[PDB]
Design a protein around this ligand. Structure first.
Ligand SMILES: Nc1ncnc2c1ncn2[C@@H]1O[C@H](COP(=O)(O)OP(=O)(O)OP(O)(O)=S)[C@@H](O)[C@H]1O
Ligand SMILES: Nc1ncnc2c1ncn2[C@@H]1O[C@H](COP(=O)(O)OP(=O)(O)OP(O)(O)=S)[C@@H](O)[C@H]1O
Ligand SMILES: Nc1ncnc2c1ncn2[C@@H]1O[C@H](COP(=O)(O)OP(=O)(O)OP(O)(O)=S)[C@@H](O)[C@H]1O
Ligand SMILES: Nc1ncnc2c1ncn2[C@@H]1O[C@H](COP(=O)(O)OP(=O)(O)O)[C@@H](O)[C@H]1O
Ligand SMILES: [Mg+2]
Ligand SMILES: [Mg+2]
Ligand SMILES: [Mg+2]
Lengths: 348, 643, 319, 328
């Protein structure tokens, strides 16, 4: 139970920022007929905290007593697939995107189980069981059509709370019915206040400028800020003014890879960067994250003229990666094209 | 009835767009007259060899080479030379403790080599040493318990022991789980009662036919007792139940799990479960001792397969069985069966290789394994074909058929061995002249970038044969990937397409071959001018060589250009640390990994740093002080470094 | 009095009459000669001679006891879970007296249609009973076979027949059947059967039964493919970057009723053996594959075809 | 227990849908004969096609037999048309006897209201044609679409086609005022006009957003901030900041602007929609408009494909910046 979990708010009045948003959510659930909630915003903005808060305000206190269950179901191609699920007697949360392009079963038959369970269970509290599909942005178009017809069919038995980082891959008939909850990343002062509250509740007294440095380094990610504060607490008992913010280790691996590509321009260095990128990919880090990190790292070294070309190249090969299957081809081919562009740019 | 289906439009008067006229501009009134006159095909006949690889001349006498190989039995001196050669190839193998055993095993055959070379003793097994000693100790303790029971019966007329009545064994396919169980049972004289998936095993059948195997004695206790009743329904020896492939449950096997749970509860005899499904360790509810068979080491199994080759009086090399094991993912059953088929067909290629570390070597097993000998002439070699320039139509067809045969398996052949296939030096990891040298490096890098651009095009904008990430997502993910095969007899009834499979296979193979030919030709003409730079005194070969790992040089060719043992230890690390009780509820998956895992590694590395400084002992107790129950091996793994 | 089809009239009866896949057929020959056959799984494209190979191997192994010691299960039989549980296990447990080195053979044709439960059951009855029975299975896509059977077998690979082999056996059938022919008909038949002996023999029998003479015109009147000379003129115009004539010929092809799928298939097949430069061939193949995946995904109109034509033309006029 | 707003104030019968003159007239003529032909409604969304066909079904049948004798289906089912055809076959095979106490017996034909008929491939369209021909005199089909050109020749030729021109801003503003006064929501005209503007002429999205706002901020006024954040529409100040950042020609402030847009949780598709809507109605040259619009189309294809938002917006803004600063 880290500070990201031990001190996670569970009441709607505890949210120090987005107070108008929290009051609006509370007033919405006071009506008792809230619709499917499509909640978006960047990672670390607090979407999970907000949906647990509205779940606790919606149901009783029993949504904290959760359990972990594995569900195994039959593919239409007659294969058995197992998938974890965090569930309770009041709500069920299932990630549907772990089945590849076969997300349509984890969308449809799992919702069938929640519907029959809500038909079996009776508690005289509410007439729906909340189904939480985290990371709905990564669902395929076929799965999202199945999702659409299921919300059209299963609306009186269950309510759907979708959580995503973007509504780009989300098909528009889905967004035509779900209530949009835009949760922006909280500002720098909000991170500073949250860090101050957490450190005071832990018996420590951090300065304001260290909290501001931590908020600026976290790039408006509250969970990363809390974890870096915890690591800084590991490093030193007092929150000194010269406290070194714990840098992300694969981030500085990516930075060293950036110095590797920009430093020397040869196919041997291209193979070495290829091996480093394979080592970085084997850590289960999603390929778009290394794409964005590589873009941000090499855009420091280029001049103002090369930035637009490198940007368009990165977007094109990122789309090629998302369409493709093996990310290594698209990624390393971006490395090769940037290498050629750099070599033909510094030669003249 | 045929009522009027009137197109009704709310055409209000005006809007200048309802009733339009053709434009008066001269461009849209100058319609070109359509021509339908194509060339006539009756006049032009299709000549021979136009759309195919038809040639007037035909090769005679080069093919149809019958082997008629009569292998002379090896003498003692040549056999001992091969034994020392393998011992120098694998200095960590106890090769002396196995050769009398296989020589006794070999001493007009009607056995498969899996059962001809079946291990009678668990010490004769290769790899998974901790697992087989655990199983042997468990079964020895069960024998001691049975002998003690017999002693108590003859005299008449358990937390500290912690003898759980069941071992559950899990591992990959063909690592020798059943071989280990049978070898232990024959060494200690047990009697296995096997329940296979091939048999009808429903709950009432298995209890009413096999409960008294556990509850009671054996009427026949002396004589023929090393025999194995496979249960089906249409010194003293102790009973031992075994369930082969427990994870395989059909609709006919009604209530099998409850039956083996009753067997769990009411047994007095050892019960063994064998399954290759890793998820069955989680689904099954009961008390059982867990034994895991890891994938065996490649060199040890390769030496054992070379050894099985020696005892059939053929000599060979280590590397070919290394790549053979790699292609089969170190499956001992598949490798032994293909080795039997390959040795008993008389060999593929007779090439002599004088090595000290004598008959002729028999290299070329992995080439016939992939079916590459059906494509190429027996004089042709794979890398010899790939390094030289492809010009003739038949060489092009051979290249396309090779790439097609590798494309159905979703394996990128030219990509995985790109270092060893380009006309460039490859070394293992441990001024106007400068302008021309940098220009040559630039040309080589441009060719490499162009080829890898076409390879990205091939993966992205060309159809693949087998639909990637069909059941799991893409590679290197910790969601799942334990997609067990189907378990129901009902048919798939899918509406997949068939044409776009072999069509896309030909398309991808042709495009990959043409792109690689272009890249290799460009590299060749780039280094044709390298002699001028060498005469100028500047050698850019340090910037042109390719650095590749030692493990990829132990094979002739690779199906993958990465390390899978590395990925396996990573995936085990994330799955083990994020299975702890407190961190088991982080739902946002991507956020969970890229935020929790590097901060946890930073915490572990900082903790190790404070422990190396001879500081206070309580600095070890932050992980236990926040109730973060992470096992110490994974904490030590996280505290090393980031690769 | 019945016209036996030339597919079944001229099927090989020995393993030395099989053309194509010389190494695997030679190993099957030596295993039929000596004996002790392992459990084999033969995989390859349709028509390359897998069923014929396993039938000839079973015949040469068994001989007069082929009616008793061989059990054949094709896709038209049940091959269910209970069939694998009872009939195959009972044949494996059956006692048949055979000479030394000979085992009973349970041929299971089209293991692709074998459901995964039947394969899961077939694992152990393949494993233990190998002292008396042996398994010879055949498929096209070996991925549809579950991994335990591939572990329990030896995987033999069959490749597409090289055009010389199909020409030689076509000439053998023609010289045994007094078929009047020209070399243009030979090239047309080899084109209409891409490494498929069954398709070549069926097309040859169909044009000989239909028109009685073997030339290119008759073969493409019976096979009814888009004519490869028209597609060659397409590719030749696009080499010269003449979009007008290429779209003229493609509009002619489209108005004849040819689907997008076989049109782009024929374009790829002609373009593979076309006489042009290597780089232009590579770019042509890449654009053809991109357009072919567009046809595969569901968008298949004249606009996509003419767009591919424009891209192929512009690849020449742009450096 | 309660119902959403969109299905609550839809007209109960025919002739109550405003702004349509001949469509409702032909519908009333068909209903007076108690025989509805195969019907095709095409028009932009939020116009009243679904309301008109549901009102016709309620008028011809009885309300207790209204739901039992109609079947609403969508053509975007993921399992092909086999499931849709089997559902239509099951509905047409089942027959429910009905009786009306109003004095008119129910007609024998059943009603299948099929939505999104223009998202249908030609093979599936021919299968639907043969399905309709199989049940010509027992089930009269309803096809709902926005574009009639996507429907192939046989089904379009055999269906009575009706066009639905979208409502004007004044009419939907008056209807939303009636909704506001009916549901006791404190409303200014500016909020309703802004709701009409952000719904882009769709009454369904406007009604849904109004109900969403009055349930999100209960017992309070409906400002422009809640409507903007519920409709998903990017603020105009953000769009003008994007335009000024691209006009500046500096990549660093461009990166800062898109980082501000992304970290605020603003969808990239909405930013692309607003950027295109501002670009095409400005004083830019036709070459600049052409290149910017081509990049917008490629980036929107990438977004619907599912590529990264930040990289796509970076590339689009870089193209816009280069195109604008090329003339400078
Ligand atoms: N470690 C090993 N050492 C020697 N021979 C082995 C080894 N593992 C497997 N074999 C051979 O492979 C044969 C079959 O192994 P099995 O134990 O049946 O495989 P398995 O572990 O049961 O996996 P399954 O049953 O296919 S899921 C044995 O009879 C041996 O001939
Ligand atoms: N290599 C070959 N040599 C000679 N004739 C062949 C060859 N391959 C096919 N044929 C002929 O084609 C006929 C049919 O071949 P089959 O073996 O039935 O095809 P297949 O290999 O079984 O592939 P399938 O059955 O479509 S999955 C045989 O009866 C022969 O007449
Ligand atoms: N002219 C109109 N008269 C009466 N109600 C109308 C009118 N135009 C729109 N509406 C109402 O607007 C709402 C939405 O219209 P619907 O008919 O349900 O959907 P739509 O117009 O068919 O657009 P779709 O279904 O998304 S293609 C309903 O509550 C209608 O009653
Ligand atoms: N009002 C708040 N006060 C303090 N901490 C918060 C608040 N809201 C969120 N957090 C913390 O910020 C982190 C955000 O992570 P999460 O809830 O998963 O959001 P997301 O799903 O957007 O990443 C949570 O771990 C939570 O502990
Ligand atoms: Mg086993
Ligand atoms: Mg066959
Ligand atoms: Mg509607």
């Amino acid at each position: 139970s880290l500070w990201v979990d031990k001190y996670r708010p569970c009441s709607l009045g505890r949210l120090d920022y987005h107070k108008e948003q929290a009051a609006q959510l509370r007033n919405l659930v006071q009506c008792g007929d809230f619709p499917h909630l499509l909640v978006y915003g960047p990672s670390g903005a607090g979407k999970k905290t907000r949906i647990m808060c509205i779940l606790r305000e919606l149901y009783g206190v029993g949504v904290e007593k959760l359990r972990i269950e594995h569900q195994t179901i039959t593919t239409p191609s007659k294969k058995k697939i197992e998938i974890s699920t965090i569930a309770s007697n009041y709500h069920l949360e299932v990630n549907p995107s772990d089945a590849g392009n076969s997300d349509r079963v984890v969308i449809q038959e799992m919702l069938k189980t929640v519907a029959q369970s809500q038909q079996l269970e009776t508690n005289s509290q509410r007439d729906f069981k909340v189904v939480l599909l985290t990371e709905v942005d990564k669902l395929t178009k076929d799965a999202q059509h199945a999702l659409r017809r299921t919300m059209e069919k299963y609306m009186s038995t269950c309510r759907l709370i979708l959580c995503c980082n973007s509504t780009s891959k989300v098909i528009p008939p889905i967004r035509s019915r779900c209530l949009a909850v835009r949760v922006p990343a909280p500002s720098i002062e909000d991170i500073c206040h949250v860090l101050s509250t957490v450190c005071k509740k832990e018996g420590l007294n951090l300065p304001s400028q260290l909290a501001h440095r931590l908020a600026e380094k976290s790039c408006r990610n509250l969970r990363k800020a809390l974890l870096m504060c915890e690591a800084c607490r590991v490093q030193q008992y007092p929150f000194t003014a010269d406290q070194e913010i714990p840098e992300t280790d694969w981030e500085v691996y990516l930075r060293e890879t950036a110095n590797a590509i920009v430093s020397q321009q040869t196919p041997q260095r291209l193979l070495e960067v290829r091996g480093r990128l394979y080592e970085l990919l084997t850590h289960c880090i999603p390929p778009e994250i290394i794409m964005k990190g590589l873009l941000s790292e090499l855009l420091h070294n280029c001049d103002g003229q090369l930035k637009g070309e490198v940007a368009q190249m990165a977007a094109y090969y990122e789309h090629r990666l998302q369409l493709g299957s093996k990310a290594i081809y698209h990624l390393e081919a971006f490395v090769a094209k940037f290498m050629a562009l750099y070599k033909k740019f510094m030669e003249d | 009835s045929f009522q009027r289906v009137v197109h009704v439009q709310q055409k209000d008067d005006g809007c200048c767009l309802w009733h339009l006229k053709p434009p008066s501009c001269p461009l849209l009134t100058k319609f070109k007259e359509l021509n339908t006159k194509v060339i006539d095909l009756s006049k032009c006949g299709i000549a021979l060899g136009e759309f195919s690889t038809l040639n007037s001349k035909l090769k005679s006498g080069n093919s149809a080479a019958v082997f008629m190989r009569t292998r002379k039995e090896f003498t003692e001196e040549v056999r001992n030379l091969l034994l020392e050669e393998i011992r120098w190839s694998n200095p960590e193998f106890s090769l002396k403790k196995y050769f009398p055993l296989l020589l006794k095993k070999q001493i007009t055959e009607d056995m498969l080599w899996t059962e001809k070379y079946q291990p009678q003793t668990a010490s004769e097994l290769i790899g998974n040493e901790l697992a087989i000693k655990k199983l042997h100790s468990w079964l020895k303790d069960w024998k001691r318990r049975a002998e003690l029971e017999e002693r108590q019966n003859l005299k008449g007329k358990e937390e500290e022991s912690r003898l759980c009545n069941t071992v559950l064994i899990t591992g990959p396919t063909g690592v020798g789980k059943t071989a280990a169980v049978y070898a232990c049972a024959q060494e200690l004289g047990f009697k296995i009662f096997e329940v296979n998936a091939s048999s009808q095993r429903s709950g009432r059948q298995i209890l009413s036919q096999l409960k008294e195997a556990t509850q009671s004695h054996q009427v026949d206790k002396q004589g023929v007792n090393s025999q194995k009743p496979c249960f089906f329904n249409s010194k003293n020896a102790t009973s031992l139940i075994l369930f082969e492939e427990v994870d395989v449950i059909f609709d006919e096997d009604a209530g099998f799990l409850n039956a083996i749970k009753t067997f769990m509860a009411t047994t007095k005899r050892p019960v063994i479960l064998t399954t290759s499904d890793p998820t069955f360790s989680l689904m099954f509810d009961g008390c059982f001792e867990e034994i895991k068979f890891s994938t065996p080491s490649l060199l040890n199994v390769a030496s054992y397969l070379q050894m099985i080759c020696l005892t059939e009086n053929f000599r060979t090399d280590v590397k070919d069985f290394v790549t053979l094991l790699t292609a089969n993912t170190c499956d001992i059953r598949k490798s032994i069966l293909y080795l039997q088929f390959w040795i008993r067909s008389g060999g593929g290629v007779l090439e002599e290789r004088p090595l000290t570390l004598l008959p002729k070597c028999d290299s070329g097993c992995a080439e016939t394994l992939f079916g590459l000998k059906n494509i190429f002439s027996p004089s042709e070699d794979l890398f010899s074909f790939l390094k030289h320039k492809i010009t003739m139509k038949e060489e092009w067809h051979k290249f396309i058929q090779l790439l097609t045969e590798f494309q159905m398996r979703n394996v990128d052949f030219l990509y995985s061995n790109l270092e060893f296939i380009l006309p460039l030096p490859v070394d293992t990891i441990p001024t106007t002249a400068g302008k021309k040298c940098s220009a040559l490096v630039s040309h080589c890098l441009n060719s490499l970038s162009e080829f890898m651009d076409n390879m990205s095009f091939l993966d992205a904008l060309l159809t693949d044969v087998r639909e990637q990430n069909k059941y799991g997502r893409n590679d290197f993910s910790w969601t799942n990937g334990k997609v067990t095969s189907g378990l129901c007899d009902e048919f798939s009834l899918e509406s997949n397409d068939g044409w776009t499979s072999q069509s896309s296979g030909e398309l991808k193979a042709a495009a990959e071959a043409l792109s690689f030919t272009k890249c290799s030709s460009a590299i060749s003409k780039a280094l044709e001018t390298l002699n001028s730079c060498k005469k100028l005194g500047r050698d850019p070969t340090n910037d042109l060589t390719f650095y590749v790992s030692q493990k990829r040089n132990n094979v002739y060719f690779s199906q993958s250009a990465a390390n899978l043992d590395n990925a396996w230890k990573r995936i085990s690390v994330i799955k083990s640390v994020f299975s702890s009780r407190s961190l088991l509820y982080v739902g946002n998956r991507q956020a969970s990994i890229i935020e929790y895992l590097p901060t946890l590694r930073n915490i572990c590395k900082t903790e190790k740093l404070k422990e190396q400084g001879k500081s206070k002992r309580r600095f070890l107790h932050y992980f236990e002080g926040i109730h973060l129950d992470i096992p110490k091996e994974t904490v030590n793994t996280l505290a090393a470094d980031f690769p | 009095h019945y016209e036996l089809p030339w597919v079944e009239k001229y099927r090989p009866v020995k393993l030395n009459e099989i053309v194509g896949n010389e190494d695997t057929v030679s190993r099957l020959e030596v295993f039929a000669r000596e004996g002790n056959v392992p459990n084999i799984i033969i995989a390859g494209p349709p028509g390359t001679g897998k069923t014929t190979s396993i039938l000839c191997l079973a015949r040469a192994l068994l001989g007069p006891a082929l009616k008793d010691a061989m059990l054949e299960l094709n896709a038209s039989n049940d091959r269910g879970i209970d069939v694998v549980r009872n009939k195959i296990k009972m044949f494996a447990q059956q006692k048949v007296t055979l000479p030394k080195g000979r085992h009973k053979i349970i041929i299971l044709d089209e293991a692709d249609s074998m459901t995964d439960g039947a394969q899961q059951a077939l694992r152990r009855t393949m494993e233990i009973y190998s002292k008396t029975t042996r398994f010879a299975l055949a498929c096209n896509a070996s991925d549809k076979i579950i991994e335990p059977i591939q572990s329990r077998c030896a995987v033999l690979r069959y490749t597409k027949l090289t055009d010389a082999q199909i020409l030689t056996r076509l000439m053998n059938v023609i010289e045994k059947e007094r078929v009047p022919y020209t070399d243009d008909g030979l090239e047309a038949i080899i084109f209409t059967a891409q490494g498929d002996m069954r398709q070549a023999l069926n097309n040859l029998q169909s044009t000989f039964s239909g028109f009685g003479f073997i030339n290119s015109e008759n073969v493409f009147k019976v096979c009814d493919e888009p004519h490869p000379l028209l597609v060659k003129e397409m590719i030749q115009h696009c080499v010269n970057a003449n979009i007008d004539e290429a779209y003229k010929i493609l509009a002619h092809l489209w108005h004849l009723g040819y689907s997008p799928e076989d049109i782009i298939g024929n374009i790829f097949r002609v373009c593979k053996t076309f006489q042009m430069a290597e780089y232009l061939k590579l770019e042509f193949i890449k654009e053809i594959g991109y357009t072919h995946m567009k046809i595969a995904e569901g968008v298949n109109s004249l606009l996509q075809m003419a767009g591919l034509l424009a891209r192929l033309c512009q690849k020449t006029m742009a450096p | 227990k309660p119902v959403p707003w969109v299905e609550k104030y839809r007209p109960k019968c025919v002739d109550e849908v405003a702004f349509q003159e001949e469509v409702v007239a032909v519908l009333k003529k068909s209903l007076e004969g108690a025989d509805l032909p195969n019907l095709l409604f095409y028009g932009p969304p939020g116009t009243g096609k679904t309301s008109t066909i549901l009102a016709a079904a309620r008028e011809l049948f009885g309300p207790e037999l209204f739901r039992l004798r109609v079947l609403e289906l969508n053509a975007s089912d993921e399992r092909g048309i086999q499931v849709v055809r089997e559902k239509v076959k099951n509905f047409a095979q089942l027959t429910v006897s009905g009786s009306r106490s109003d004095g008119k017996p129910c007609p024998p034909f059943k009603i299948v209201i099929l939505d999104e008929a223009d998202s249908m491939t030609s093979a599936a369209q021919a299968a639907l044609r043969r399905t309709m021909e199989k049940e010509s005199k027992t089930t009269r089909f309803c096809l709902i679409c926005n574009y009639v050109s996507r429907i192939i020749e046989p089904l379009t030729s055999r269906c009575s086609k009706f066009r639905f021109k979208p409502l004007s801003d004044k009419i939907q503003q008056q209807r939303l005022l009636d909704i506001a006064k009916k549901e006791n929501v404190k409303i200014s005209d500016e909020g309703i006009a802004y709701l009409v503007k952000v719904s882009e002429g769709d009454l369904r999205k406007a009604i849904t957003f109004l109900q969403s706002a009055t349930r999100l901020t209960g017992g309070k006024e409906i400002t422009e901030k809640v409507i903007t954040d519920i409709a998903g529409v990017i603020p105009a100040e953000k769009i003008d900041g994007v335009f000024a950042a691209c006009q500046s020609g500096s990549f660093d402030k461009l990166e800062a602007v898109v980082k501000d847009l992304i970290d605020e949780g603003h969808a990239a598709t909405q930013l692309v929609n607003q950027l295109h809507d501002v670009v095409v109605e400005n004083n830019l040259s036709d070459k600049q408009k052409s290149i910017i619009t081509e990049k917008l189309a490629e980036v929107d294809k990438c977004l619907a494909d599912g590529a990264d938002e930040h990289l796509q917006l970076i590339s689009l803004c870089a193209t816009v910046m280069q195109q604008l600063s090329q003339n400078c």
